[PDB]
RNA sequence: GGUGAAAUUCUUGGAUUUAUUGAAGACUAACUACUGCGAAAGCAUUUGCCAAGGACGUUUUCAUUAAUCAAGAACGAAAGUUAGGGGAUCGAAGAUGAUCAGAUACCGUCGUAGUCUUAACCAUAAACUAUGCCGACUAGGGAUCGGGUGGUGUUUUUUUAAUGACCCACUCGGCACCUUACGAGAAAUCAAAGUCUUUGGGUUCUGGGGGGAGUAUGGUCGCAAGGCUGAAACUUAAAGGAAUUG
């Protein structure tokens, strides 16, 4: 997949993984 | 040497434009040439049916009567194409053997100071 | 008290008797004490000044409008509120304005406006923080606040009242031709819905 | 400009600031021009003006503010008239103004 | 020591009401407690109370303004445009 | 059929004095019926007449020209000045790469209550003995120079009437004039006014407007 | 690797140049890269001058700068694709 | 009307077209270039004001006051966020008309945000010359920008100068281009990417096979979107670069 595409996908990765632990935070 | 009035003329793609009407402006004469003759919504440009319709034109023009005028005809300009259609002059070419004389002639297409940001993005029509 | 914006005590004297009369002005932005205010026909375009629509340029500013020539003012007298003059047609002497509501209306060119845009705009910009603010500013203009919602009211209160559930159970918009008791949501909504898009008068 | 101009009697000759002592100093003939700042009150401006009329002295209007004087002259306080007592080597009292 | 990083004025709210709000009332909390510059006597002696009332400690004098400010930025404009229709009915 | 031919009949202009050749030719408003009719709704037009159809030869053949009708009567529909404009084709074709162009414009009035934005142009020449093939000048000519063209424009249209001024440029030596003070500053071929707009005039004064006719 | 020194068209030393729009396809592309070719078209012509007044007074024609977005000038204009030692060749023909 | 062609669409409401004419916001065409300026971002109508800058010139002044720089700071395209105003244009979203097997698109249409401006943020771009800064040396060539010098050079003719523009030669500093290669390079190509195994002028920064991954973790900045800092377990024999032939 492209490059940028690629960052999009991890950058929304991120977003969900810091969601997912600011509910035990 | 003879009366005068105003020719009017507008070229775009896929259509043509063309009408006579008082110096003045006020008053217009007869004016519908676009897709009149024609009918594939394709040829409506095409120079064949710019002439086909140029010729009811000049008929309208002398049925009521008069023998010149000198053109203002235009493309549609604006922020698109800068630059004469097909059904232009192709009919100011059966027009003018017409039997009808000609004089001052000039553009009157509109053209601005590089602004009003044209259509399709940076990107434009892909294709 | 009650009011947003500022009133201006101004003094003149009594052209039929030695008198002096004070009327009471609402405070366009920037008059101050001991400013010479000047009302007529011919009088000049300063701010602060009472001319009739008929003796300003199109695009003046001015506030406490009359409706009708003489009504002592009308329109544009909240706080921060103004209307625009946008026309004359001095054949039936008229001349078409712009309101703070947006609508265009033509009144006569007799009537009187104060050059200027009325004082203490703005207010509304602050947030009022808390319920007692809100209740400090009720006691001076009415007695309409707190609101009871409808909707918790029983059938006999309200329309909307009663149910197992808080629901206004039928549609909120009300015709025009409603009858009193039977007025009570969004009357004559020609719409509803959260207004989107850009949004200002032609 | 001009502010250039004051800003030379300053360091050449004699003056005077304040309505006070620029008062007596007129009624005493010894100003030859007085300035007043643009928001100096019209009474104050009216009367200053009468005084220089009969000591023949001429004036200059300040477009600027009592402020604007003071710190054209160098001083640190609002100054609403100056009056010239020596133009040491300015030229204002024979420039345009 | 500088006592607050942000609160500045606000503080006495606390805790309640919510960032934003505060934040917004703090603006032109600023604003309608400041002094501002008296045009007519050119101290820093102009005040609000009342608002859209502004007054000058000395030379006693009163000017009508904006809720928070002396100047609104719309009063500004209108001035401008005012001074401009009347330079235009002269010459 | 309704047949407009058989419908109201035509009129005609005549250019002010102000000229040589003044008959325009004709025009057709409406029959004057007496409810709403060609009394109070035609003197509100403009025609596109050239010069060189005006006064001569085609030394004159590249300005356009504006013809405001001011009023009728009998036989009347005679119209005074709306302005002017140059042509697409002469100006494209002064606008070549290779060389500055230098544009500048006024609102000046006359004794005839008249303000008005007039425009120049201006090129630059290059001198017939030089070598560089653009031809530029720099910047302190150019504002130099739109200085002085503004200072001779504004110096012409406020030392006259709109008749004498229409009388003043149509010889041309405008276009001229500028050179006097640029021979000093810069070759400068190719300048002409190019173009006049305009906003108002003071109520019709017809007693006025009659004396450009004999 | 570049396959042309400029690397694009006629631009050195100022890192910005606000771009135009192609006349084919609206799309914008850098002036200093836009391809420019002057369009100097007449109204033709034998006809159009005897059953006429004015015996050919004039004969104006269209004047109009166009620009192209490169990949439309490929396609139709004047861009004849080159090869590597014949494209440095900046002559006009 | 719009296109390759159509269709959604607009037309008793006189549309598309014409004339006169007014409003609003945005933009600065053509002139425009291997042309200028700025630390970079970036900067193109006019005029007035405000301070600011390089190159030149200089038998003026000071006299080592400098070079480059962790920490720290100023600015910083676009989009994006907060509070007003603006909101004409074009226009993520979303809704549609068509095409397609399908078509969340490309083409068409409507149009929200946005696009503009003020106050405050955000600090990232293939922010590119994918090429650190100061110094010195090494090579030929005609253009051009600015300053300068030289002149019984041409043109303005006024009456010839003075001037202005122009020609020619030279010299500083610019933006390039051209030819060569001594020389360099893995090559493409390079007056630096040269003066290196005959390896040392001063100084700043980054990289050490490919993935993992700019992920995890901590710290910190931000309203948020996110920015700076930034691993490892494990996995893998290639992945890459320039050039040749197909
Ligand atoms: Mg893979
Ligand atoms: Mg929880
Ligand atoms: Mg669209
Ligand atoms: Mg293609
Ligand atoms: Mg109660
Ligand atoms: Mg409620
Ligand atoms: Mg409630
Ligand atoms: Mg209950
Ligand atoms: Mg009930
Ligand atoms: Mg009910
Ligand atoms: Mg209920
Ligand atoms: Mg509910
Ligand atoms: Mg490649
Ligand atoms: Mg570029
Ligand atoms: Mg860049
Ligand atoms: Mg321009
Ligand atoms: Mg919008
Ligand atoms: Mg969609
Ligand atoms: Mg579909
Ligand atoms: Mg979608
Ligand atoms: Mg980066
Ligand atoms: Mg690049
Ligand atoms: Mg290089
Ligand atoms: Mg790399
Ligand atoms: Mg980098
Ligand atoms: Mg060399
Ligand atoms: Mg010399
Ligand atoms: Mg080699
Ligand atoms: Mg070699
Ligand atoms: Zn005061
Ligand atoms: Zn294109």
Same mark, same amino acid.
């Given at each position: 997949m492209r490059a940028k595409w690629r960052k999009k996908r991890t950058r929304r990765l991120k977003r969900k993984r810091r969601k997912v632990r600011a509910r035990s935070k | 040497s003879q009366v005068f009035g105003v020719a009017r003329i507008y070229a775009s793609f896929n259509d043509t434009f063309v009408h006579v009407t008082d110096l003045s402006g006020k008053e217009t004469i007869a004016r519908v040439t676009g897709g009149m003759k024609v009918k594939a919504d394709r040829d409506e440009s095409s120079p064949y049916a710019a002439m086909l319709?140029?010729?009811?034109?000049?008929?309208?023009?002398?049925?009521?009567?008069?023998?010149?005028?000198?053109?203002?005809?235009?493309?549609?300009?604006?922020?698109?194409?800068?630059?004469?259609?097909?059904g232009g002059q192709a009919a100011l070419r059966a027009l003018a053997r017409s039997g009808l004389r000609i004089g001052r002639i000039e553009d009157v297409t509109p053209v601005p100071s590089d602004s009003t940001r044209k259509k399709g993005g940076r990107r434009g029509r892909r294709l | 008290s009650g009011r947003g914006a500022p009133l201006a005590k101004v003094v003149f004297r009594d052209p039929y008797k030695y008198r002096l009369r004070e009327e009471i002005f609402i405070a366009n932005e920037g008059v101050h004490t001991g400013q010479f205010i000047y009302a007529g026909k011919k009088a000049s375009l300063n701010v602060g000044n009472v001319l009739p629509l008929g003796s300003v340029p199109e695009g003046t500013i001015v506030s406490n409008v009359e409706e009708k020539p003489g009504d002592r003012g009308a329109l544009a007298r909240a706080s921060g509120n103004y209307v625009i003059i946008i026309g004359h047609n001095p054949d039936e002497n008229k001349t078409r304005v712009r309101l703070p509501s947006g609508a265009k209306k033509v009144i006569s060119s007799d009537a009187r406006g104060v050059i200027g845009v009325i004082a203490g705009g703005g207010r509304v910009d602050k947030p009022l923080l808390k319920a007692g603010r809100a209740f400090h500013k009720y006691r001076l203009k009415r007695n309409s606040w707190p609101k009871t919602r409808g909707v918790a009211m029983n059938p006999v209160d309200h329309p909307h009242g009663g149910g197992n559930h808080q629901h206004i159970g039928k549609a909120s918009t009300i015709s025009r031709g409603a009858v009193s008791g039977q007025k009570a949501g969004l009357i004559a909504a020609r719409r509803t819905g959260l207004l989107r898009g850009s949004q200002k008068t032609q | 400009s001009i502010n250039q101009k004051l800003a030379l009697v300053i360091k050449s000759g004699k003056y005077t600031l304040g309505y006070k002592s620029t008062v007596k100093s007129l009624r005493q003939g010894k100003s030859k021009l007085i300035i007043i700042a643009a928001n100096t009150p019209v009474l104050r401006k009216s009367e200053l003006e009468?005084?220089?009329?009969?000591?023949?002295?001429?004036?200059?209007?300040?477009?600027?503010?009592?402020?604007?004087?003071?710190?054209?002259?160098?001083?640190?306080?609002?100054?609403?008239?100056?009056?010239?007592?020596?133009?040491?080597?300015?030229?204002?009292?024979?420039?345009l103004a | 020591?500088?006592?607050?990083?942000?609160?500045?004025?606000?503080?006495?709210?606390?805790?309640?009401?919510?960032?934003?709000?505060?934040?917004?009332?703090?603006?032109?909390?600023?604003?309608?407690?400041?002094?501002?510059?008296?045009?007519?006597? /050119?101290?820093?002696?102009?005040?609000? /109370?009342?608002?859209?009332?502004?007054?000058?400690?000395?030379?006693?004098?009163?000017?009508? /303004?904006?809720?928070?400010?002396v100047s609104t930025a719309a009063a500004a404009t209108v001035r401008s445009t005012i001074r401009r229709l009347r330079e235009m009915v002269e010459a | 059929?309704?047949?407009?031919?058989?419908?109201?009949?035509?009129?005609?202009?005549?250019?002010?004095?102000?000229?040589?050749?003044?008959?325009?030719?004709?025009?057709?408003?409406?029959?004057?019926?007496?409810?709403?009719?060609?009394?109070?709704?035609?003197?509100?037009?403009?025609?596109?007449?050239?010069?060189?159809?005006?006064?001569?030869?085609?030394?004159?053949?590249?300005?356009?020209?504006?013809?405001?009708?001011?009023?009728?009567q009998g036989k009347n529909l005679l119209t005074n000045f709306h302005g002017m404009d140059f042509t697409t084709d002469k100006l494209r074709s002064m606008v070549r790469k290779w060389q500055t162009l230098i544009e500048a414009n006024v609102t000046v009035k006359t004794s005839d209550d008249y303000v008005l934005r007039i425009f120049a142009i201006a090129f630059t020449r290059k001198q017939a003995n030089q070598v560089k093939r653009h031809s530029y000048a720099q910047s302190s000519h150019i504002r130099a120079i739109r200085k002085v063209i503004s200072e001779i424009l504004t110096k012409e249209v406020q030392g006259s009437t709109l008749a004498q001024l229409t009388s003043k440029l149509i010889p041309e030596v405008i276009n001229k004039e500028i050179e006097n003070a640029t021979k000093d500053i810069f070759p400068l071929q190719n300048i002409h006014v190019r173009k006049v707009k305009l906003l108002k005039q003071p109520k019709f004064d017809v007693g006025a407007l009659m004396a450009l006719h004999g | 690797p570049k396959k042309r020194a400029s690397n694009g068209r006629n631009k050195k030393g100022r890192g910005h140049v606000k771009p135009v729009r192609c006349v084919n396809c609206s799309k914008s592309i850098p002036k200093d890269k836009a391809i420019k070719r002057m369009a100097i078209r007449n109204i033709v012509v034998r006809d159009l001058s005897e059953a006429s007044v004015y015996p050919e007074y004039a004969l104006p024609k269209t004047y109009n700068k166009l620009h192209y977005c490169v990949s439309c000038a490929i396609h139709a204009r004047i861009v004849r694709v080159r090869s590597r030692e014949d494209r440095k060749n900046r002559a006009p023909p």
């Amino acid at each position: 997949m492209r490059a940028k595409w690629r960052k999009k996908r991890t950058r929304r990765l991120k977003r969900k993984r810091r969601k997912v632990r600011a509910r035990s935070k | 040497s003879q009366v005068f009035g105003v020719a009017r003329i507008y070229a775009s793609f896929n259509d043509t434009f063309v009408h006579v009407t008082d110096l003045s402006g006020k008053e217009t004469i007869a004016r519908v040439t676009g897709g009149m003759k024609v009918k594939a919504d394709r040829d409506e440009s095409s120079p064949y049916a710019a002439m086909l319709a140029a010729q009811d034109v000049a008929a309208k023009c002398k049925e009521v009567g008069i023998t010149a005028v000198h053109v203002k005809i235009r493309a549609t300009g604006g922020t698109r194409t800068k630059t004469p259609g097909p059904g232009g002059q192709a009919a100011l070419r059966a027009l003018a053997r017409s039997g009808l004389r000609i004089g001052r002639i000039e553009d009157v297409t509109p053209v601005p100071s590089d602004s009003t940001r044209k259509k399709g993005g940076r990107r434009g029509r892909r294709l | 008290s009650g009011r947003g914006a500022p009133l201006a005590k101004v003094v003149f004297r009594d052209p039929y008797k030695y008198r002096l009369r004070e009327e009471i002005f609402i405070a366009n932005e920037g008059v101050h004490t001991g400013q010479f205010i000047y009302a007529g026909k011919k009088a000049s375009l300063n701010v602060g000044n009472v001319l009739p629509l008929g003796s300003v340029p199109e695009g003046t500013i001015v506030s406490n409008v009359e409706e009708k020539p003489g009504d002592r003012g009308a329109l544009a007298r909240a706080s921060g509120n103004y209307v625009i003059i946008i026309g004359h047609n001095p054949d039936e002497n008229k001349t078409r304005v712009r309101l703070p509501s947006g609508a265009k209306k033509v009144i006569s060119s007799d009537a009187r406006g104060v050059i200027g845009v009325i004082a203490g705009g703005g207010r509304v910009d602050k947030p009022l923080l808390k319920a007692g603010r809100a209740f400090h500013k009720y006691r001076l203009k009415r007695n309409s606040w707190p609101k009871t919602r409808g909707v918790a009211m029983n059938p006999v209160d309200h329309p909307h009242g009663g149910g197992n559930h808080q629901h206004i159970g039928k549609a909120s918009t009300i015709s025009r031709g409603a009858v009193s008791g039977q007025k009570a949501g969004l009357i004559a909504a020609r719409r509803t819905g959260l207004l989107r898009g850009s949004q200002k008068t032609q | 400009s001009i502010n250039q101009k004051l800003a030379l009697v300053i360091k050449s000759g004699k003056y005077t600031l304040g309505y006070k002592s620029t008062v007596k100093s007129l009624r005493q003939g010894k100003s030859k021009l007085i300035i007043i700042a643009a928001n100096t009150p019209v009474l104050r401006k009216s009367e200053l003006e009468y005084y220089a009329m009969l000591s023949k002295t001429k004036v200059y209007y300040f477009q600027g503010g009592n402020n604007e004087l003071g710190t054209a002259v160098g001083k640190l306080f609002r100054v609403g008239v100056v009056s010239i007592l020596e133009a040491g080597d300015s030229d204002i009292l024979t420039t345009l103004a | 020591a500088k006592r607050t990083k942000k609160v500045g004025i606000t503080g006495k709210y606390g805790v309640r009401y919510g960032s934003s709000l505060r934040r917004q009332v703090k603006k032109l909390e600023i604003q309608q407690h400041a002094r501002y510059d008296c045009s007519f006597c /050119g101290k820093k002696t102009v005040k609000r /109370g009342a608002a859209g009332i502004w007054t000058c400690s000395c030379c006693k004098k009163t000017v009508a /303004g904006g809720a928070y400010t002396v100047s609104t930025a719309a009063a500004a404009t209108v001035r401008s445009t005012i001074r401009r229709l009347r330079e235009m009915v002269e010459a | 059929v309704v047949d407009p031919f058989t419908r109201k009949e035509w009129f005609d202009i005549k250019a002010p004095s102000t000229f040589e050749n003044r008959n325009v030719g004709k025009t057709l408003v409406n029959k004057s019926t007496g409810l709403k009719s060609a009394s109070d709704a035609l003197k509100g037009r403009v025609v596109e007449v050239c010069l060189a159809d005006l006064q001569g030869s085609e030394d004159h053949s590249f300005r356009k020209i504006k013809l405001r009708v001011d009023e009728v009567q009998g036989k009347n529909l005679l119209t005074n000045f709306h302005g002017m404009d140059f042509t697409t084709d002469k100006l494209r074709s002064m606008v070549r790469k290779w060389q500055t162009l230098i544009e500048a414009n006024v609102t000046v009035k006359t004794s005839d209550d008249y303000v008005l934005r007039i425009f120049a142009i201006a090129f630059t020449r290059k001198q017939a003995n030089q070598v560089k093939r653009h031809s530029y000048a720099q910047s302190s000519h150019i504002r130099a120079i739109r200085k002085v063209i503004s200072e001779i424009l504004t110096k012409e249209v406020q030392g006259s009437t709109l008749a004498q001024l229409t009388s003043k440029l149509i010889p041309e030596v405008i276009n001229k004039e500028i050179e006097n003070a640029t021979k000093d500053i810069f070759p400068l071929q190719n300048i002409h006014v190019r173009k006049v707009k305009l906003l108002k005039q003071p109520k019709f004064d017809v007693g006025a407007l009659m004396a450009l006719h004999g | 690797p570049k396959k042309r020194a400029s690397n694009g068209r006629n631009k050195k030393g100022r890192g910005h140049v606000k771009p135009v729009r192609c006349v084919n396809c609206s799309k914008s592309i850098p002036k200093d890269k836009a391809i420019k070719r002057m369009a100097i078209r007449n109204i033709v012509v034998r006809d159009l001058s005897e059953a006429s007044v004015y015996p050919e007074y004039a004969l104006p024609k269209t004047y109009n700068k166009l620009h192209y977005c490169v990949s439309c000038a490929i396609h139709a204009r004047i861009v004849r694709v080159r090869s590597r030692e014949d494209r440095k060749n900046r002559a006009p023909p």
